[PDB]
């Protein structure tokens, strides 16, 4: 009986749920050629978090723990803690710690550390390759490449803050990251577990609607496109509201609040993704003050007004 | 049009509104001796954002713009844009661009840049000294100290991502940052404008309640304590709900959902800060699952149950 709704927020007011950066635009494209199975930004419309999804956007692609130096290298193994520094439990029924990256690529950021006895601190450039054999966050271990072979201490609180992505400029431009390729969360010690399911439009003539950002690039010629299935604020809002789904499909209209004019309509599926009636790869051009409005639950046969 | 409320979120599920990091604890202490006037994390209970507050946790202490430098210099001046890359208008009735840092200190992070013709990218260590004469975000310009004297291009999209704070280890430990000292947003040039007001308890025996985090340290012996008056999620929630204030004070109770018991009560003032009945500098020790819950609107001279 509690009524469903989505937040009154513009696209630019919202945040990507797969990296800590604002949304920029709405994009639609076919996706039959590849598997769409992101693990961050996954939530049902009645507020059940899925995959590796957690609530605050600043924890997305962050890691915390302590580090051990790999002798003869500038590499360090982080022994992960949970996002609140609690001991990490690998038997929890999740694919990896909440907020773990859900794509294969090279994420550059900064490893910072505090020494607890005296409050001394340090920071160094660091990169995590999430396709590495040594990317094993589900087992509590992640390897970082850094610019030091000596400065970090053992058993001291250490954090990785993500900044952006890189690419090898001597190879084909934009060939990485690969945002729809999941990592092996156990570094191939075993298969991935407890995943949010892959998504695909099932209705004739429909495509996914993607909430898109441009990740910062730190070196090379990376593919900076990053698409999420739900804005982080929608995850946060559905978790709070926990309104029951009266059918499997919520009908949303995208509206200009100055005029009341509806720009387009789309389907928000109960399991947490959006489709539109469109064929082709296109950016939507929108009014900056436009926002989504929930109008009606609809049945499995409802045909959207075509766009594009 | 529901009654006024606060979100059902634990302390650790929420985010500092003054730096993009999680909350860690609740802290109370006297503040009669200094000025408490932060500009981020400022919002009335009915959803009016104040100061430099905006909605995105990830934009707090971020800057966007393009950069120039004097030939041979490691210091780059950024000509600021708005957070969505729009032109920045210095005649807007705000203290500085939304999300500008609201304390004097040295914030270290990374300046990233993309060259639009070919998608080439670059990233460099960067520090902004918010006490500098060259820190003039209200005028549209700030300077970054970087580790390059040649590797940024003019007129290209450039972003500063914050990571943590630093201190000069050759001087008294923890002497900076100074979290309650506001920068001069227009440089040495003129006084600050359009500030969210200073806050103080007015009821006898009351103190402010602070939502506290520890900022990452990147070098030296910084003071990493960071207190905000409202979690970022409460700013987001009040903006979204916009419930009118029925008196000047909302009584909240902190509830342990493990037991049903109320641990303490506090006053949420309609202008956006919290007070408790206590004398002393003390950390609150809480159940991890504890959360705040609205109980009722109260008159101006309600007396809280004492704590501590």
């Amino acid at each position, epitope marked *: 009986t509690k009524p469903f709704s989505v937040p009154v927020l513009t696209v630019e007011e919202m945040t990507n749920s797969r990296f800590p950066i604002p949304l*920029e*635009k*709405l994009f*639609t494209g076919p996706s039959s050629a590849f598997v769409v199975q992101p693990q961050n930004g996954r939530c049902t419309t009645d507020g059940v978090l899925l995959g590796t999804t957690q609530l605050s956007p600043v924890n997305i692609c962050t890691f915390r723990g302590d580090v051990t130096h790999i002798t003869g290298s500038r590499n360090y193994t982080m022994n992960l803690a949970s996002q609140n520094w609690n001991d990490y439990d690998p038997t929890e029924e999740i694919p990896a710690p909440l907020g773990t990256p859900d794509f294969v690529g090279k994420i550059q950021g900064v490893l910072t550390q505090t020494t607890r006895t005296d409050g001394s601190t340090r920071g160094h450039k660091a990169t995590v390759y999430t396709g590495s054999a040594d990317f094993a966050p589900k087992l509590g271990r992640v390897q970082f490449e850094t610019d030091t072979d000596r400065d970090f201490e053992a058993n001291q609180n250490t954090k990785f803050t993500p900044v952006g992505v890189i690419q090898d400029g001597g190879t084909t431009h934009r060939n990485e990251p690969q945002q729809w390729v999941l990592p092996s969360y156990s570094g191939r010690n075993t298969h991935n577990v407890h995943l949010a399911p892959a998504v695909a439009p099932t209705f004739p003539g429909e495509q996914l609607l993607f909430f898109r950002s*441009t990740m910062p690039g730190c070196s090379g010629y990376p593919n900076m496109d990053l698409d999420c299935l739900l804005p982080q604020e929608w995850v946060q809002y559905f978790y709070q509201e926990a309104a029951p789904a009266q059918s499997d499909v919520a009908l949303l209209r995208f509206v200009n609040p100055d005029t009341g004019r509806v*720009l*387009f309509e789309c389907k928000l599926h109960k399991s947490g993704y959006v489709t539109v009636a*469109h064929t*082709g*790869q*296109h*950016d*939507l*051009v*929108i*009014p*900056p003050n436009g926002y989504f409005r929930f109008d009606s639950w609809v049945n499995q046969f409802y045909t959207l007004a075509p*766009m*594009g | 049009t529901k009654p006024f409320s606060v979100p059902v979120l634990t302390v650790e599920e929420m985010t500092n509104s003054r730096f993009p990091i999680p909350l860690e604890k609740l802290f109370t202490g006297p503040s009669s001796a200094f000025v408490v006037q932060p500009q981020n994390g400022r919002c009335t209970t009915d959803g009016v954002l104040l100061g430099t507050t905006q909605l995105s946790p990830v934009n707090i202490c971020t800057f*966007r*713009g*393009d950069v120039t430098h004097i030939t041979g210099s490691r210091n780059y001046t950024m*000509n600021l*844009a708005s957070q969505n*890359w*729009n*032109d920045y208008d210095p005649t807007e009735e705000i203290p500085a661009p939304l999300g500008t840092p609201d304390f004097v200190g040295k914030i270290q992070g990374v300046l990233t840049q993309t060259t*639009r*013709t070919d998608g080439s990218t670059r990233g460099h260590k960067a520090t902004v000294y918010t006490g500098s004469a060259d820190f003039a975000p209200k005028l549209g310009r700030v300077q970054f100290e970087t580790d390059t004297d040649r590797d940024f291009e*003019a*007129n*290209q*999209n*450039t972003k500063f991502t914050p990571v943590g704070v630093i201190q000069d280890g050759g001087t008294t430990h923890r002497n900076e940052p100074q979290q309650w000292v506001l920068p001069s947003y227009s440089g040495r040039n003129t006084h600050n404008v359009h500030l969210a007001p200073a806050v103080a308890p007015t009821f006898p025996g009351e103190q402010l309640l602070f939502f506290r985090s520890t900022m990452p340290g990147c070098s030296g012996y910084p003071n990493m304590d960071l207190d905000c008056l409202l979690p970022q999620e409460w700013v987001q929630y009040f903006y979204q709900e916009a419930a009118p204030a029925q008196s000047d004070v909302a009584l909240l109770r902190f509830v342990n959902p493990d037991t049903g018991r109320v641990l303490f009560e506090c006053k949420l003032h309609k202008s956006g800060y919290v007070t408790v009945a206590h004398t002393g500098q003390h950390d609150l020790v809480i159940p991890p699952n504890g959360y705040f819950r609205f109980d009722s609107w109260v008159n101006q001279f309600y007396t809280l149950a004492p704590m501590g």
Partner: nanobody
Amino acid sequence: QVQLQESGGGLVQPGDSLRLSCATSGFILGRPVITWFRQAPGKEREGVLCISGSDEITYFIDSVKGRFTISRDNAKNTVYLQINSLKPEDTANYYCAARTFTAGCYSRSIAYPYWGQGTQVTVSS
């Protein structure tokens, strides 16, 4: 996959007129803000004038307002820049740039995610 492509430049005669076109593909729904920039020798790309999705026009350089006209042809997904009475000061590489919004005419290059490769205008000696 958005694409912008400018055409219409060349070595042109003072006092003649010309028409640049900015052809776009890859957008749906609203009509995008489009702005013409130019880069004169030794300078950065500078914003000249802009047309919103509602065809509201903003000039960023006051000296061009007598002679430069921007317009939109929705049916051919093109925006034009017509220049009357060409003058040597008009000489530059001309770029069009687009935003995925119907409103917001901004003067700075960083406000635009999408760009063409440019067309050169040289008012000949």
